Amino acid sequence: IGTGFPFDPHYVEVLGERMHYVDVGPRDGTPVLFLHGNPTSSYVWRNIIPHVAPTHRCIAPDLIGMGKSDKPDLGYFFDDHVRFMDAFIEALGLEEVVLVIHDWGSALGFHWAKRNPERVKGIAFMEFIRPIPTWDEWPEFARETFQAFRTTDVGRKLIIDQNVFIEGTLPCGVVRPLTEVEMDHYREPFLNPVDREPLWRFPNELPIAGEPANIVALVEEYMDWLHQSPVPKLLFWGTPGVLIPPAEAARLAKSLPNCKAVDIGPGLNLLQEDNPDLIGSEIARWLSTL
Ligand SMILES: CCCCCCOCCOCCOCCN[C@H](O)c1ccc(NNN)cc1
Ligand SMILES: [Cl-]
């Protein structure tokens, strides 16, 4: 599994900040837009993009405050990322897109797709943001840690000061051991603790047990839209997973229209880091059908 990030940096101005993105493949055709989440960056797509770049344009932005993108003075709420990603999409002049989305990026993709259904030709997703109406539906092994994360004293102490989300939560979202090179690639944007605000605000935006209300409403909305959308869907899942356990993935695969489902084997949250070969191969093959 590759550790290197061999991509020339691209930068675009958006709402006064500079956003970094990978842009490879042919200039023409329908672009494939890769959206990462917390606590990663476009580095999480480094081994999947090369299966798609031979025949399709690949665009992979770094969310604002993450990756190589600018890090302004923000609360980094979900709405901030919504604004910035909308402006990024409109600044690259994209009309029709195929979405490949993960974690909070999925929330960004889905919420974009619901508002622009005519502009989405396909969605490939995995370990995505779904409503969790009670804490019982959250994974037991992450319950205590993510409840502690959702406070302004202990949560900020763990995530902001001690970098627990990068040094602990991130490698526990991967079955196989991450190497020190990959760990350094994930550490790079957050070496300065004051730059760790998104790492803390993201788990505090998670829609668990009705809080926060706005995110619960929004995520419920795009799930309702997805359940009746004819958009072609490609769902990846792993064992035991984090945000999507196998039983939920099977339920969704049976209920979602035009949905191909793929079990990647052992996997937690960062499915890209456990089985990139299968994910990239399946995405290339599935794109061949849009
Ligand atoms: C917004 C997107 C969602 C982000 C979710 C992040 O995912 C992590 C969630 O789990 C964290 C709580 O885990 C506690 C128990 N974990 C086991 O101790 C453990 C230990 C080591 C390994 N791997 N070693 N290579 C795997 C598991
Ligand atoms: Cl999170």
Q: Is the dihedral of CA 68, 145, 157, 200 positive or negative?
A: positive
Residue with the smallest CA separation from ligand 1 atom 26 is 172
Alpha helix (H) ranges present in the chain?
A: 78-91, 104-115, 140-149, 154-156, 164, 180-187, 197-205, 213-226, 246-255, 271-274, 276-287
As given in the structure block, the two tokens for residue 29 are 């055709």
Experimental method: X-ray
Return the ligand 1 atom nearest residue 268 CA. Answer: 7
250 lines ligand 1 (CB under 6 A): no
As given in the structure block, the two tokens for residue 154 are 């202990």
Closest ligand relative to 159 C-alpha: 2
Q: 140 CA to middle of ligand 1, Å?
A: 11
**Residue ranges of domains in the chain:** 10-288
Q: Is 2 left (phi over 0), alpha (psi -120 to 50) or beta?
A: beta
Q: 260 CA to middle of ligand 2, Å?
A: 26
Q: Is 148 left (phi over 0), alpha (psi -120 to 50) or beta?
A: alpha
Question: 284 phi and psi, to 5 degrees?
Answer: -60, -50
Question: 260 phi and psi, to 5 degrees?
Answer: -95, 135
104 lines ligand 1 (CB under 6 A): yes
Closest ligand relative to 204 C-alpha: 2
Beta-carbon neighbours within 5 Å of ion ligand 2: 38, 202-203
Q: 37 CA to middle of ligand 2, Å?
A: 8
Cα separation of the two ends of the chain: 28
Q: 191 CA to middle of ligand 1, Å?
A: 21
| Neighbouring residues of 32: CB distance < 8 A, sequence distance ≥ 6 | 25, 52, 56, 57, 58, 59, 97, 98, 99, 100, 283, 287
CATH architecture, domain defined by 10-288: 3-Layer(aba) Sandwich (3.40)
269 lines ligand 1 (CB under 6 A): yes
As given in the structure block, the two tokens for residue 257 are 């229209």
Distance CA 120, CA 113 (A): 6
204 lines ligand 1 (CB under 6 A): no
* CA angle 249–250–255, rounded 5-degree value: 100
Distance CA 16, CA 162 (A): 30
Question: 94 phi and psi, to 5 degrees?
Answer: -75, 135
Closest ligand relative to 102 C-alpha: 1
